[PDB]
Design a protein around this ligand. Structure first.
Ligand SMILES: Nc1ncnc2c1ncn2[C@@H]1O[C@H](COP(=O)(O)OP(=O)(O)OP(=O)(O)O)[C@@H](O)[C@H]1O
Ligand SMILES: Nc1ncnc2c1ncn2[C@@H]1O[C@H](COP(=O)(O)OP(=O)(O)O)[C@@H](O)[C@H]1O
Lengths: 28, 213, 213
């Protein structure tokens, strides 16, 4: 029996929260 | 303010003498002669022995004794991360202060003490542990690449502690690389007397111990 | 300044004579000879031997004896990429200057020397690892393509160092990329003499050595 695991990341820069604030402001 | 007795370590007088001679001799003499010589200070020390022989306490007291900054200690493999690349990033952050301080003042900085416990946990023979992810072989390569290499550092000192000294890397214990390799062994009768006295000092001073013993 | 003792090397004259004979010769000859012969300039070297046995000593001295721009040195497996792809971006950012210079000027560009410490850290068996992420394969293939491939290079020199030539994939050792290989065994008695002298000149300069020694 054997084996180990690993992990990684990626370039995402979502910031959907800020974009949502901005676009809502645009609507009003 | 200092005193060898103040520490409360007994039976290892020769060990302390050798450590002081081969480690702290160049840091106490007037700067002029040592600078007239062009000698590089030793920056490596290794200890090992069976459990409970006073290895931990030794490093605790040697660190406390210095008038330098608080030593940075690493508790076993505590520098591992769940991603690719941050084992090295962690083993690299340990030297930022020394490099920065050397580049700011230079030749006049205070010592930077780093302590590894059970070095054998992380540093082992390359080419072994043929499992997966090769992370261990990358960490060992970084550590050596950083203890020594293209860049120079002269205000650091690393202490390692192990119980099985046959599994550590060869270069890690080579000249200028944990070169000093000491051997803590079971105490003698005189060591036993000194130890018992050390651990029975707060009693005689309060009449809590019968004179019969 | 080709004193070779002012530089500070352990009696490795024969080593330098042989390396210049083998390589660095086509580099100082008439290009017209290179057109009649049609023999390209060697661009691969390897230096391995007892760990840190003056292995980086001369690596830190070659940067001085050259009338070209200072060679760029890669100190260990610092080609870390956390998101995705930038490992290949890092590998790319090493050869950009050579590409730009060759495009700007041809047949007389100059030389660019790159040094990989801990070559063994990043170059291993391609298929041996079973890890989910294949970053090592990705970097190995990219490096192989860059050093050898449809694109041609004539103004670079890659130098590799390992303390254990064994864990190296054979593809990187195919003729035409790193065909040259050399070992640095141990110092002879005579070289040991020059060594002692080099390591004792300041001692005698300031009159700190007893005549008995
Ligand atoms: N023949 C020699 N002549 C002069 N110095 C030598 C010689 N052999 C070893 N040394 C010493 O060894 C050191 C050379 O750097 P070294 O080769 O140890 O670096 P390194 O390759 O990064 O080390 P490592 O491979 O252990 O990580 C210097 O302290 C140098 O004085
Ligand atoms: N020279 C000494 N002086 C005082 N106490 C000692 C000495 N050597 C061992 N001891 C005792 O042994 C214990 C230290 O064990 P330790 O060195 O921590 O084991 P390990 O090195 O495996 O961590 C302490 O309880 C301490 O009282």
């Amino acid at each position: 029996i054997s084996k180990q695991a690993l992990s990684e990341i990626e370039t995402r820069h979502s910031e959907i929260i800020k974009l949502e604030n901005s676009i809502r402001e645009l609507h009003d | 303010d200092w005193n060898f007795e103040k520490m409360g370590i007994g039976g290892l007088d020769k060990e302390f003498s050798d450590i002081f001679r081969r480690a702290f001799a160049s840091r106490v003499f007037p700067p002029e002669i040592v600078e007239q010589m062009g000698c590089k200070h030793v920056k490596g020390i290794l200890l090992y022995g069976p459990p409970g022989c006073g290895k931990t306490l030794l490093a605790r007291q040697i660190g406390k004794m210095l008038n330098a900054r608080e030593p940075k200690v690493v508790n076993g493999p505590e520098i591992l991360n769940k991603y690719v690349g941050e084992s090295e990033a962690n083993i690299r952050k340990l030297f930022a202060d020394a490099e920065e301080e050397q580049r700011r003042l230079g030749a006049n900085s205070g010592l930077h003490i780093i302590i590894f416990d059970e070095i054998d946990a992380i540093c082992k023979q390359r080419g072994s542990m043929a499992g997966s992810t090769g992370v261990h072989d990358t960490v060992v390569n970084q550590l050596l690449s950083k203890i020594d290499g293209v860049e120079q550092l002269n205000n650091i000192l690393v202490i390692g502690m192990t119980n099985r000294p046959d599994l550590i890397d060869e270069a890690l214990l080579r000249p200028g690389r944990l070169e000093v390799k000491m051997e803590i062994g079971l105490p003698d009768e005189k060591g036993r007397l000194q130890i018992l006295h050390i651990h029975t000092a707060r009693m005689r001073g309060h009449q809590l111990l019968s004179a019969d013993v």
